[PDB]
């Protein structure tokens, strides 16, 4: 089948072959230069309403692991900030490194974090995720850096189930997970127009990247590295370095909600 990954032959440098938008004008991630990002005090506070979030399952898709939510109603939504309308949470996933010193997709003054959490939301005025991804204003991804440090209690339920989804295609029931437990205390953010960071690389994302990282323990992130990109009974290829490097900003402006 058509496929892609993060290896020498199928990795980010080659994605352009099947997905020519890889060289587009609004690609993600980007490096955030804190001295040139533009303060915009017209940006509203972000409203994160996750009180009724309903997680369903966790799965290994061969590129990362997703925790999927019931997005049939407004149970977990993002509003405000730079957004117009209501964006419903569909899933979250991470990108991470082979070493603590790398793994994030966005960087801040070229600094890489150990991992990056993406909470993926779609604009309810398009009716479903499939329609939303084909629109410039279809998705809002909230990106949250993970810095190695203190353990994050809220991540532990995720870590504890990874052994049941080791290889590509494995899934497991994953109910009653509270995504509020992955948020930092400050909701100060950068924002810019961009894309999905994996194929098909669609330019449909309003990026909202939080200034404040969450901590996770060296042991928590190590558990991510023990997942496999490959399927069961295939040669073991550890799921590490599933990040796209920073792409050119081109004519875009990154805005900060804070000075």
Question: Which residues are identified as catalytic?
Answer: 63
Q: What is the CA radius of gyration of the chain?
A: 17
Helices (H) and strands (E) in the chain, counts: 3, 15
Partner that binds at residue 18, options Na ion, Zn ion, a copy of itself, none, CB closer than 5 to 8 Å by kind: a copy of itself
Q: Is 2 annotated as a binding residue?
A: no
Q: Which is nearer to a copy of itself, 20 or 169 (CB)?
A: 20
Partner that binds at residue 33, options a copy of itself, Zn ion, Na ion, none, CB closer than 5 to 8 Å by kind: Na ion
List contacts with Na ion (CB under 5 A): 33, 109
Q: Is 35 annotated as a binding residue?
A: no
Partner that binds at residue 38, options Na ion, Zn ion, a copy of itself, none, CB closer than 5 to 8 Å by kind: none
Q: Is 118 annotated as a binding residue?
A: yes
User: Going by C-beta distance under 8 Å and a sequence separation of 6 or more, which residues neighbour residue 81?
Assistant: 43, 44, 45, 46, 47, 140, 189, 191, 208, 257
Fill in the per-residue mask, 16 to 55: x = in contact with a copy of itself (CB under 8 A), - = not in contact: -xx-x-----------------------------------
What is the spatial distance between Cα 74 and Cα 77, in angstroms, rounded to a whole number?
Answer: 6
Query: Is residue 85 close enough to count as binding a copy of itself by CB under 8 A?
Result: no
Partner that binds at residue 126, options a copy of itself, Na ion, Zn ion, none, CB closer than 5 to 8 Å by kind: a copy of itself
Concatenate the DSSP letters of all residues of 87-131 into one string: EEEEEEEEEE-SSTT---SSEETTBPPSEEEEEEEEEGGGSSHHH
Best CA proximity match to 211, nearest among 243, 180, 254: 254
Fill in the per-residue mask, 112 to 151: x = in contact with a copy of itself (CB under 8 A), - = not in contact: --------------xx---x--------------------
CB of 221 to Zn ion, least distance (A): 16
What is the spatial distance between Cα 239 and Cα 205, in angstroms, rounded to a whole number?
Answer: 25
Best CA proximity match to 89, nearest among 52, 64, 62: 52
Give 117's strand partners: 94, 144
Which parts are annotated binding residues for Zn(2+)? 93, 95, 118
Q: Pick out the residues of the known binding site for substrate.
A: 197-198
Binding site residues, a copy of itself, CB under 8 A = 17-18, 20, 126-127, 131
């Amino acid at each position: 089948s058509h496929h892609w990954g993060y290896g020498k032959h199928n990795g980010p440098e080659h994605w352009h072959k099947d997905f020519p938008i890889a060289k587009g004008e609004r690609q993600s991630p980007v490096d955030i230069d804190t001295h040139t990002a533009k303060y915009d005090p017209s940006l509203k506070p972000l409203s994160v309403s996750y009180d009724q979030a309903t997680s369903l399952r966790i799965l290994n898709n061969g590129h990362a692991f997703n925790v999927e939510f019931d997005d049939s109603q407004d149970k977990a939504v993002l509003k405000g900030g730079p957004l117009d309308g209501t964006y419903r949470l569909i899933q979250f996933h991470f990108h991470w490194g082979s070493l603590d010193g790398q793994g994030s997709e966005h960087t801040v003054d070229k600094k890489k974090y150990a991992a990056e959490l993406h909470l993926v939301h779609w604009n309810t005025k398009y009716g479903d995720f499939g329609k939303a991804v084909q629109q410039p204003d279809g998705l809002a991804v909230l990106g949250i850096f993970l810095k190695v440090g203190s353990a994050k209690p809220g991540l532990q339920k995720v870590v504890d189930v990874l052994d049941s989804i080791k290889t590509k295609g494995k899934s497991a029931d994953f109910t009653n997970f509270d995504p509020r437990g992955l948020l930092p205390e400050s909701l100060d953010y950068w924002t810019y127009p961009g894309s999905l960071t994996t194929p098909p690389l669609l330019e449909c994302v309003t990026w909202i990247v939080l200034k404040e990282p969450i901590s996770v323990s060296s042991e928590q992130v190590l558990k991510f590295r023990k997942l496999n990109f490959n399927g069961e009974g295939e040669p073991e290829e550890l799921m590490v370095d599933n990040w796209r490097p920073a792409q050119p900003l081109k004519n875009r402006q990154i805005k900060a909600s804070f000075k």
